[PDB]
Amino acid sequence: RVAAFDLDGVLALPSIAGAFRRSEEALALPRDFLLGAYQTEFPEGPTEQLMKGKITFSQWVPLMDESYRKSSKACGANLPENFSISQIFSQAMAARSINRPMLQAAIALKKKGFTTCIVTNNWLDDGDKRDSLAQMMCELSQHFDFLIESCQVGMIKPEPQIYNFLLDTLKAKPNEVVFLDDFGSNLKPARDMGMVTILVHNTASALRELEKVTGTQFPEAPLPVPCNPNDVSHGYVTVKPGIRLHFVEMGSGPALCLCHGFPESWFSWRYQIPALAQAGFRVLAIDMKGYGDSSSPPEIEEYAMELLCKEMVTFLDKLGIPQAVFIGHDWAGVMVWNMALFYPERVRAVASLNTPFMPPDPDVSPMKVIRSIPVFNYQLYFQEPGVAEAELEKNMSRTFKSFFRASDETGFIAVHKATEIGGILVNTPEDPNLSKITTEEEIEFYIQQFKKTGFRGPLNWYRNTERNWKWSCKGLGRKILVPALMVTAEKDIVLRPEMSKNMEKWIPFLKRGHIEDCGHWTQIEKPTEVNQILIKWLQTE
Amino acid sequence: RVAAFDLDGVLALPSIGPTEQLMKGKITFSQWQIFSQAMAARSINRPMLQAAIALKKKGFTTCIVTNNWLDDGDKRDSLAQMMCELSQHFDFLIESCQVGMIKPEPQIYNFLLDTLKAKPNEVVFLDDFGSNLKPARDMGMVTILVHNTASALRELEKVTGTQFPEAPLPVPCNPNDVSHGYVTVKPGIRLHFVEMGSGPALCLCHGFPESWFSWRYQIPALAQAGFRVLAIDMKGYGDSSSPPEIEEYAMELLCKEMVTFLDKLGIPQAVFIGHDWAGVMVWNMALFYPERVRAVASLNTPFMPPDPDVSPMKVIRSIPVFNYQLYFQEPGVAEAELEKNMSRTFKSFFRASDETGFIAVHKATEIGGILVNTPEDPNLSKITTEEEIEFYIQQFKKTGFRGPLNWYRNTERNWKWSCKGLGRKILVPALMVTAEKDIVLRPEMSKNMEKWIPFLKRGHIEDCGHWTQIEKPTEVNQILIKWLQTE
């Protein structure tokens, strides 16, 4: 089966046709005077030349204005002497956007496994604001297998051949296909061909109703569009002789680097990458040193935070980028705060998820501080080379299902006792049922990513306590004056909100956000909420 | 050997208790006014930066030992660009506010020497203060006092190193010291590219028989000019998928795949600028996908639409200078010649408008080989280095030549496709840069262009052949930037 959508009217609103009627009234001319050009059946003149893509937009402007001057005052109502369809048409175009519940309904049937597409009477926009259209087209791109645009294949609706070309493309019969459109006259031939007709009258709802009435049903609040993974651009930068970072890229300027935490990957930001790009930014979801597709050397000294921060700067220099907004989580969160503290010039802004900015005391050995907090036990367990590696690697499937579970789920990790019972996966069953926060598919990606790195590299992050302490002490007399955000996860066992209360002594002006019923895996557990927060912050400051 | 430079006023001009330590690094800047802009209103000293890339090219360890400070300023990006930019020309960066030390504190110098791994002899230092220089000559290293704006400076500086010019080439980026991207547009097909700088997007597309490396002189300059460069490897070339099917290089399909390359990359609009064959594609992008084209620029290649009453092969068969174009039409044939020995192939192809050993564009068929009239041992053009030549050799050992040549082989369908937009005009911003002494693709072939592209802006370079970018880089750069800034 397959489902196809017209764009002006079902995937995109308000129908541009709307602004046609609006100014029709706005000028005293006869019902369908200006809309006849766009909504007809028998399309002639320049509009047919347009939607068949024989002439661009700009050309059509003058030529149509004149086809109007004829028809006009010269056969009915007075069409102003100095009058033009240009700024009115190019505005209801730029003043229109996506119909989410509808795009939502399509992503569904696709996720469900349906051939989706768009069959629309397009035109080539050489307009002053054709950008609005490129974005809409860019973004809709991902969700449909096919896109039959009138202005590219030379047909137009209801002219019969377009439909027949649709079927030849989807390679199907008129039965297995459902057609959504806002005109109905454009729908008269589909039914007549043995197709399903649904008039997208409304704005959806009444139409998505007679839609679940065939196939399935759509979430009340669907989870955001996750970016993934063979559909993405993969970058590679070589920062130092043997070392090279890998990352993923989406969207257009200004730069914003998403840094993940232990034991994850760039794929963790899967829900924020799209949304963030679409929000106007050039996303760079990087694989941290020691992870996935970047260099994972064995030396411990190699993961010192001082050296890790220096190499983030180099990653920008080689990439040509002079400033980015860094937003980290877990361990990256720490790094990110140190980037803000050590390389302010390169930081447009900083955001942290769960991880507070916790500077060190120069009169308090750093290991002692870890040895005291009952909840950083595992942190100690990790301190010994080969040990935790061996446990985590024995069976990567449990390891991941064990680690990634919701704030309201069982099978948890052993952050408190690890060293007594010797392990974190010790009390964890060796067949965790699968969290409701990830899929086998998602789990598999992490498995594969770590078969390439093993776990030494990632763990070496925990192993630089001393020097890290000695390094950070260098900026105890400074303050973080660049823009900052702190988002806290309520039910996050380690890295509890309360650990941030003092933060503003170092970061005045620090803005703040907070998510309830949320554990450590903020991005994966409360994505939409994280997205909302993150965007508002980026827009606001 | 080594060369050290300051910045307070040597690689950047105009020049510039609690302050005594802003330098060391304890307090930031903001934690401290009609002087911040004195930082913003300053820039790089190119003759001084030039000298440095010289010694580096010449094989020297180069560096910057400066009394820095942390800028949490509101206008701190000035410093980011200056720094980001200088970044690539120095191997080590001994910034005071980073290692806790400040000239003339004798330790910083003992720190420079350590890092570098050397004695005060093989090391010349450059400072505009002289009182911050006493220690270095005291240590046994060569001191130089920047008084002028580099002049006598770079001179006793040359009296020591060697000879830098005065009208130098724009610095070339190169070729592992850059970020490499990879996008998979269709099941088996994937494009590779290089990226530099920050937004808005601008895709540089190369021509036959080249690579992304061809834009080596425009990539940096362009990035630094404020743009996010995407110098792509065209289908069939270097590190992107080079399938064998001919139908695979149809311009219609090639243009469609440029759109997809943006969609996957998230970019909704870019300025395309092509050259040679890409130039053609670029003009067709503007003509077929205006929505995605911020702007279009072409180098040498005019916009030459087809006539619907003139078989396209006939049009090639007539022009005496598209002979090779015909030679290419047969599969395996030109591949075999070009591939036999890739070194000649490239030295043969890349030579200046004022050089011998040329290619056989006219007589190709007749004498049966576009290289037959070439010195079997081309001496090396003055426009490329063995090093540059080698990169192209290696890039083509991976693709062979079938893929690239399949571009010439879609005459029919290309003709049939382009005819679809003969009733349109190119209304998006456009630029046409013509190379004077370009044998094929002569300026004169553009004269009619504005019938299709009114408002078409224009540029022109003299004493220039087909390899515009490589032959007149600085001039190409100048032109290209003004156009991007202006429109």
Helix (H) or strand (E) holding A198: strand A196-199
B43 CB within 8 Å of a chain A CB:
no
Rounded Cα distance, B412 and A270, in Å: 44
Bridge partners, residue A5, by sequence: A118, A180
Which chain B residues in 247-266 lie under 8 Å from chain A, judged by CB atoms? 262-266
How many CA atoms, within 13 angstroms, populate the side-chain half-sphere of residue A503?
Answer: 22
Q: Does the N-terminal peptide bond of residue B302 adopt cis geometry, omega within 30 degrees of 0?
A: no
Chain B residues in contact with A294 by the CB 8 A cut-off are none
Which amino acid is it at A34?
L
Separation between Cα atoms, residue A541 and residue B17, nearest integer Å: 34
Q: Is residue B173 part of a domain?
A: no
Q: Flag whether B168 is in a domain.
A: no
- Selected for mutation to probe chain B from A345, A478, A509 (highest B CB count within 10 Å) is A345
Reference B334, options B404, B249, B244; nearest CA is B404
CA distance A423 to A402: 12
C-beta neighbour count of A202 within 10 angstroms: 12
DSSP A268: G
Measured CA to CA in angstroms, residue A143 lies from A104, B40, B292, B363, B466 at distances of 10, 45, 19, 52, 43
Which long-range contacts link A84-93 to residues 24+ away (Cβ below 8 Å)?
A85/A34, A85/A61, A86/A61, A88/A19, A88/A23, A89/A16, A89/A19, A90/A57, A90/A127, A90/A128, A90/A129, A91/A19, A92/A14, A92/A16, A92/A18, A92/A19, A92/A20, A92/A22, A93/A16, A93/A125, A93/A127, A93/A129, A93/A132, A93/A133
Residue with tokens 């190499």: A311
Q: Can you tell me the distance from the alpha carbon of A416 to that of A413, in angstroms, rounded to the nearest whole number?
A: 9
Helix (H, G, I), strand (E, B) or coil at A251: coil
Please indicate whether, in this complex, the C-beta atoms of A252 and B228 are within 8 angstroms of each other: yes
Spatial CA neighbour of B195 closest among B212, B213, B211, B178: B178
User: A133 vs B25: CB contact, 8 Å cut-off?
Assistant: no
Closest CA relative to residue A78, chosen from A138, A28, A8: A28
Q: Name the nearest CA neighbour of A513 among A537, A487, A540, A484.
A: A487
B169 assigned to some structural domain: no
Kindly state whether residues A83 and A117 are assigned to the same domain. no
* Secondary structure of residue A52 in the 3-state scheme: coil
Question: What is the CATH classification number for the domain harbouring A157?
Answer: 3.40.50.1000
Q: How long is chain A?
A: 541
CA separation, residue A300 to residues A147, A293, A383, A456, B102 (Å): 52, 19, 11, 9, 31
In this structure, are residues B94 and B112 in contact, taking their beta carbons and an 8 Å threshold?
yes
B8 annotated as ligand-binding: yes
DSSP lists the bridge partners of residue A120 as A149
Q: Are residues B436 and B405 in the same domain?
A: yes
| Contacts with B, A 142-171, CB within 8 Å | 142, 154
Residues of chain A with Cβ-Cβ distance to B177 below 8 Å are 238, 318
- CA angle A163/A164/A165 to nearest 5° reads 90
Domain boundary among A94, A124, A155: A94
8 Å CB contact of A345 and B268 = no
CA distance A496 to A490: 7
Q: Answer yes or no: is B425 within a domain.
A: yes
Which residues, in sequence order, are bridge partners of residue B95? B66
Angle, CA of A120, A123 and A127, to the nearest 5°: 135
Residues of chain B with C-beta less than 8 angstroms from the C-beta of A342? 70
Cα B226 to Cα B201: distance, rounded to the nearest angstrom: 10
Of A60, A145, A319, A474, which to mutate for an interface test with B (greatest number of B Cβ within 10 Å)? A319
Give ∠ CA A255-A258-A262 in degrees, rounded to 5.
160
> CA dist B20 to A108, A332, A444, B65, Å?
63, 33, 55, 17
User: Considering only alpha carbons, which residue of chain B is nearest residue A256?
Assistant: B198
d(CA A273, CA A382): 31
Query: b/e per residue, B474-483, with b = 16+ CB within 10 A?
Result: ebbbebbbeb
| Closest Cβ–Cβ partner in B80, B180, B223 for A235 | B180
Smallest CA–CA distance, residue B98 to chain A, in Å, is 8
Q: DSSP secondary-structure letter at A342?
A: H
- Check CB contact under 8 Å for A319 and B196: yes
Neighbours of A112 (CB within 10 A): 11
Q: Are residues A399 and A517 in the same domain?
A: yes
SS3 A371: helix
| Whole-number Å distance between alpha carbons of A263 and A247 | 16
Domain carrying residue A59: 15-94
Q: How many domains does chain B have?
A: 2
Q: Are B77 and B190 in the same domain?
A: no
Q: Tell me if A322 and B269 make a contact (CB, 8 A cut-off).
A: no
- Considering the domain architecture, whether residues A149 and A281 belong to the same structural domain is answered as no
Q: How far is CA B454 from CA A379, B19, B449, B450, in A?
A: 68, 59, 8, 5
Q: Which of residues 495-524 of A touch B (CB under 8 A)?
A: none
Q: Which residue of B has its CA nearest to A230?
A: B184
Same domain for A414 and A295, yes or no, is: yes
Query: Is B175 in the A-facing interface, judged by CB distances under 8 Å?
Result: no
- Residue B398 inside a domain? The answer is yes
| Enclosing H/E stretch for A327 | strand A324-329
Residue A223 lies in a domain: no
Per the CB < 8 A criterion, the answer to whether A119 and A148 are in contact is yes
Look up residue A111 and give its two tokens. 């996720």
Residues B20 and B84 in one domain: yes
Query: CB–CB of A267/A229 below 8 Å?
Result: yes
Interface contact A252-B229, CB threshold 8 A: no
Q: Nearest Cα to B273, choosing from B216, B226, B232?
A: B232
Residues B193 and B109 in one domain: no
- State how far the Cα of A151 lies from the Cα of A156, in Å rounded to an integer: 8
For residues A71 and A127, membership in a common domain is answered with no
Name every residue whose Cβ is closer than 8 Å to that of residue B456 and which is 6 or more positions away in sequence.
B426, B430, B431, B432, B449, B450
A358 SS3 class: coil
Look at strands B457-461 and B430-435 and give their pairing: parallel
**B191, B211 Cβ separation under 8 angstroms:** no
Residue B344 lies in a domain: yes
Q: Which of A462, A459, A301 is nearest to A370 (CA)?
A: A462
Measure the CA–CA gap between B129 and A2, rounded to whole angstroms: 75
Instruction: Output the DSSP codes for A422-474.
Output: T-SSSSS-SS-PPPSSS-HHHHHHHHHHHHHHTTHHHHTTGGGHHHHHHHHGG
B170 inside domain: no
* DSSP string computed for A66-108: HHHHHHTTTTSS---SS--SHHHHHHHHHT-EE-HHHHHHHHH
Which among B87, B290, B420 is the nearest to A126, CB-wise? B290
Asked whether residue A8 is marked as a ligand-binding residue, the answer is: yes
Domain-ending residue, one of A32, A63, A94: A94
Q: Both tokens of residue B85?
A: 């930019």
Q: Whose CA is closest to A393, among A439, A332, A330, A453?
A: A453
Backbone breaks in chain B (C–N > 2.5 Å) follow which residues?
16, 32
Q: What is the resolution of this structure in A?
A: 2.8
Q: In this complex, which of B85, B179, B421 lies closest to A235 when CB atoms are compared?
A: B179
CA distance linking residue A180 with residue B251, whole number of Å:
33
Interface of B with A in 281-340 (CB under 8 A): 288-292
Q: How far is A29 from chain B (nearest CA, A)?
A: 31
Q: Is A253 helix (H, G, I), strand (E, B) or coil?
A: coil
Interchain CB contact of A233 with B (< 8 Å): yes
Cα angle A468-A469-A475, degrees, rounded to a multiple of 5 = 95
Method: X-ray
Instruction: Judge whether B237 is annotated as a binding position.
Output: no
Q: Which residues contact B344 (CB under 8 A, 6 or more apart)?
A: B371, B374, B376, B377, B378
Could you tell me if B142 and B212 lie in one domain? no
- Contact criterion met (CB < 8 Å) for A479 and B199: no
Q: Are residues B429 and B282 in the same domain?
A: yes
CATH number at residue A401: 3.40.50.1820
B114 is in an annotated binding site: no
Q: How far apart are the first and last CA of chain B?
A: 46
- Whether residue B97 sits in one domain with residue B54: yes
Token couple for A7: 């764009």
Contacts by B452-457 with C-beta closer than 8 Å and gap 24+?
Answer: B452/B303, B452/B305, B452/B425, B452/B426, B453/B303, B453/B425, B453/B426, B454/B425, B455/B427, B455/B429, B455/B430, B456/B426, B456/B430, B456/B431, B456/B432, B457/B429, B457/B430, B457/B431, B457/B432, B457/B483, B457/B487
B289 is catalytic: no
Query: What's the first-to-final CA gap in chain A, in angstroms?
Result: 46
Q: Two tokens at A212?
A: 């679940």
The catalytic residues of A are 330, 462, 520
Of A185, A215, A245, the residue that ends a domain is: A215
